[PDB]
Amino acid sequence: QALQKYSTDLTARAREGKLDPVIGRDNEIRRVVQVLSRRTKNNPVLIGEPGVGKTAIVEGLAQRIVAGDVPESLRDKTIVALDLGSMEFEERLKAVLDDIKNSAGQIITFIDELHTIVGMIKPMLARGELRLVGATTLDEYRKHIEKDAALERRFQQVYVGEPSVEDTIGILRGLKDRYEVHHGVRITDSALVAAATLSDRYITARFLPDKAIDLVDEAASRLRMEIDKEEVGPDDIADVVSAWTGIPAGRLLEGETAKLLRMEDELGKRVIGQKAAVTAVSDAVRRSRAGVSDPNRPTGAFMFLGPTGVGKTELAKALADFLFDDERAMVRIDMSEYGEKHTVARLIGQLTEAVRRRPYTVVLFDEIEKAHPDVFDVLLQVLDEGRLTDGHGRTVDFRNTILILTSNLGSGGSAEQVLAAVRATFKPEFINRLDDVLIFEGLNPEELVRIVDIQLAQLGKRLAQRRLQLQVSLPAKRWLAQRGFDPVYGARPLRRLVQQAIGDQLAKMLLAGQVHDGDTVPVNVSPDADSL
Amino acid sequence: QALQKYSTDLTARAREGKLDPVIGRDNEIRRVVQVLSRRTKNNPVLIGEPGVGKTAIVEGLAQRIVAGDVPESLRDKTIVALDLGSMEFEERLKAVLDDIKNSAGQIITFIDELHTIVGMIKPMLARGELRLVGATTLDEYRKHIEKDAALERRFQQVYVGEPSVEDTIGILRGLKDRYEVHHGVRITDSALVAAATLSDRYITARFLPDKAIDLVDEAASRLRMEIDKEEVGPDDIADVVSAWTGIPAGRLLEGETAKLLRMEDELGKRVIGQKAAVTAVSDAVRRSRAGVSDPNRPTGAFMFLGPTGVGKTELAKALADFLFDDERAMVRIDM
């Protein structure tokens, strides 16, 4: 009788249909019924990454008990959900345990989020009297419970993994009716495919099904606001995923075959030349979207190097541009700081807990020369297996990210002077695990004019606040090429040449008068410098 | 009936015109109406740096409800502002919650400054019965609420950012009539541009619109003192921003193209020579006031070095002299 005062009653709420219907997952329900009906030590624990549905399994168990699909010795045993917040203390707990044990096993207790239970129940668990069902996250478990190894021997870990898209479409078709009643709007199953398809290539921070329910909910709310078009559709889902995450401007809907047909030429609008090392980067993407890729390997793990000032960092930020519609959603770590043997621990982690959220980001590794040859040992099982560990004991899978390695070794080797210098620092067990080692060339003064066009278009887009168009003639536009010189420092001194020629006198003539908004500022070739 | 004794009633004060008119910000009002009318977990939280107007949004919502521009299932639902200072304790709180739940959702509760609520409402929030609107500062939130992550899952963060000058001019044109009645003086819209323009390059400690209302208020008060010139103007605004912060003496009126035309030669009255390294410092200021600067970069980040005893610290205190009219308003850290 004392459990009336310190508990809810899920069976009493289930007997009036006040629970959301649980669709899917026969295996976990059968596993819970298998574990909960053994003789001794009969108390499972649900464990998984958050959001995949763990309360939903216990509510589905309550639905299946009240329906009656269970075996014989599980029928009509109410699930009394306990508390520890609402609950002299030791007297109260002993009264609760005495009231449970006084019954004939007719009660299944349910402590949700039992990682707070650490802060006298220990002999009662192992004898087998009180049946206990729980739910933890995977990473509060190893911090609060696995520290206390006397307790955790008396449980049964039931892992729950996230589904794929194909089951989520069925879940969304199941739960369609509940939101149409609360918000008085109709929902079309044409949009219900897109709200799960499009929520995987864009929102890569949370886990699955709960993320693909917030879109339907917020779209229905926006439609109720507009009805303050009588049904939702595939456009308002895109409106929500634009206005949140600001992805609308970043590649408004993409990922078709019309795109991937033009990728060697679409990427050329920001990288000029280097043609033999775009036809290979443009190939590990097409063969991974056709389904020919090796299912236990990263989709592409290749290392390109060469002289400086060539475009080897600009390329690895340009192929992260149409995959993500942004340029800051990539894992950019810099190994120019790991000179000693004990900076392994900052990524084993800073590398780890930025992938496990959204397992699709491209990863940089800038200037891998300066790392001591101990960081390569950490990197060795990243390649060719795809998994590493950390303190909590989880094996994070790098099976579908695009690793990219940069270097500057040799920097001017003829044909094999640059290639045999790689063999000095890298042990042959690391050169073997890579893909095709790409060499960038220098730059040709024939292919150096168009970089000036790109730079001046960039400076034109910088002055969009002032609406300040500027006119550049072709003799000046080829005058800037000839000071682009001395192929040791690459195209980088051109981007100081532009700010020494145009930007100085423009910045002086901008803040003293005679240049205002909407005006046109032409440049003209004075016999040495550039005039205004 | 118990809410009569532990609450105010903003709707009852709004029904006699006793609230200052709320002008601007359609987006936040539409966002609050969107969040407050969902099915479950329907309780927003307004969050922003202080002074940008967060009570003003809830008072604008009350104005828009009493007017009637809302949708159908938000009409005639009074906003009863609760308290926790004026409020045996658990009995009293359960009486309040029972009185709220006894209605049919006809009441929108309003706990202002809800970061004191930590020190039994937890099941009532997630079911969706009591509608709750709040307002925290951005930096008391992460100290009092984000420590207690079971609570903060049941809210909806609605960020509110400060406006620019262009909307503040409209706000000041809106609220011009209210101070002309309390202080019996006229206010000229010529000065009303300057009281927002000049309050951005000088007073850089508080945030926006509330800072540009104190100048109009204290200027009207000084003019009432002198009438103990029949209207305020662009001079007394400058008098206030002189007498407070002592900026009046430090450059009487800062800004213009006549100034920035002479900056390589005006700066030479305190630094002699070094001519090739004043024509570059005098360039990151002119190109940043013309609008050619890169909008995501500091306007100038340059490093100068050399031998000792040359003037490399005297220069960096001389270009902080005509921008600020002082020489001590700079962030001088020493590494």
Curated annotation (Swiss-Prot), chain A:
Homohexamer. The oligomerization is ATP-dependent. The gene is clpB. The keyword Chaperone applies. It comes from Mycobacterium tuberculosis (strain CDC 1551 / Oshkosh). This is Chaperone protein ClpB. It is found in: Cytoplasm. GO terms for molecular function: ATP binding; ATP hydrolysis activity. The lineage of its organism: Bacteria, Bacillati, Actinomycetota, Actinomycetes, Mycobacteriales. Part of a stress-induced multi-chaperone system, it is involved in the recovery of the cell from heat-induced damage, in cooperation with DnaK, DnaJ and GrpE. Acts before DnaK, in the processing of protein aggregates. Protein binding stimulates the ATPase activity; ATP hydrolysis unfolds the denatured protein aggregates, which probably helps expose new hydrophobic binding sites on the surface of ClpB-bound aggregates, contributing to the solubilization and refolding of denatured protein aggregates by DnaK. ATP 2 binds at residues 306-313. Belongs to the ClpA/ClpB family. One of its GO terms (biological process) is protein refolding. Keywords: ATP-binding, Chaperone, Coiled coil, Cytoplasm, Nucleotide-binding, Repeat, Stress response. Residues 256-442 are annotated as: NBD2. ATP 1 binds at residues 48-55. Residues 443-532 are annotated as: C-terminal. The Clp repeat (R) domain probably functions as a substrate-discriminating domain, recruiting aggregated proteins to the ClpB hexamer and/or stabilizing bound proteins. The NBD2 domain is responsible for oligomerization, whereas the NBD1 domain stabilizes the hexamer probably in an ATP-dependent manner. The movement of the coiled-coil domain is essential for ClpB ability to rescue proteins from an aggregated state, probably by pulling apart large aggregated proteins, which are bound between the coiled-coils motifs of adjacent ClpB subunits in the functional hexamer.
